[PDB]
Structure 1
Amino acid sequence: MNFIQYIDDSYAVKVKEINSSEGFYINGIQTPFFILSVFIGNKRVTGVEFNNYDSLPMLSVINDLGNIDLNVIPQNYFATAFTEIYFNIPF
């Protein structure tokens, strides 16, 4: 079970599954979102990156393992809705 934890526009934590066909990709959020964490095989992974989307803040948030505070990230870093994001997980 591969799934991502992300916050919507209203700063609410939600979980969405990942489609593993022809790679790892996510789409159809329907709202501005900021990806928080990625889980592959019911475990937390680090060192992931996007091969088509350039965004340092989400990479920095994902790669850190400790608990984070949602009061430090502004609305600027939020990605636009209906965005196709691909994952490159090391293995």
Structure 2
Amino acid sequence: MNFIQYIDDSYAVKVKEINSSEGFYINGIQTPFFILSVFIGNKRVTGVEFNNYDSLPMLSVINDLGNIDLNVIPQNYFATAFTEIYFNIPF
């Protein structure tokens, strides 16, 4: 079970599954979102990156393992809705 934890526009934590066909990709959020964490095989992974989307803040948030505070990230870093994001997980 591969799934991502992300916050919507209203700063609410939600979980969405990942489609593993022809790679790892996510789409159809329907709202501005900021990806928080990625889980592959019911475990937390680090060192992931996007091969088509350039966004340092989400990479920095994902790669850190400790608990984070949602009061430090502004609305600027939020990605636009209906965005196709691909994952490159090391293995």
Q: Name the TM-score class by shorter chain.
A: over 0.9
Deviation at 1:20, TM superposition (A): 0.0
Question: How many percent identity over aligned positions?
Answer: 100
How many residues get paired?
A: 91
Deviation at 1:27, TM superposition (A): 0.0
Deviation at 1:2, TM superposition (A): 0.0
TM normalised by structure 1 equals 1.00
Unaligned 5+ segments in structure 1 are none
Q: Counterpart of 1:57 in 2: which secondary structure?
A: helix
**Aligned mates of 2:53, 2:35 — CA distance in 1:** 12
Aligned-pair Cα RMSD in Å? 0.0
Q: What per-residue deviation string (whole Å, max 9, x for no partner) do you get for residues 42-89 of structure 1?
A: 000000000000000000000000000000000000000000000000
Q: Counterpart of 2:39 in 1: which secondary structure?
A: strand
Q: What per-residue deviation string (whole Å, max 9, x for no partner) do you get for residues 21-40 of structure 1?
A: 00000000000000000000
Unaligned 5+ segments in structure 2 are none
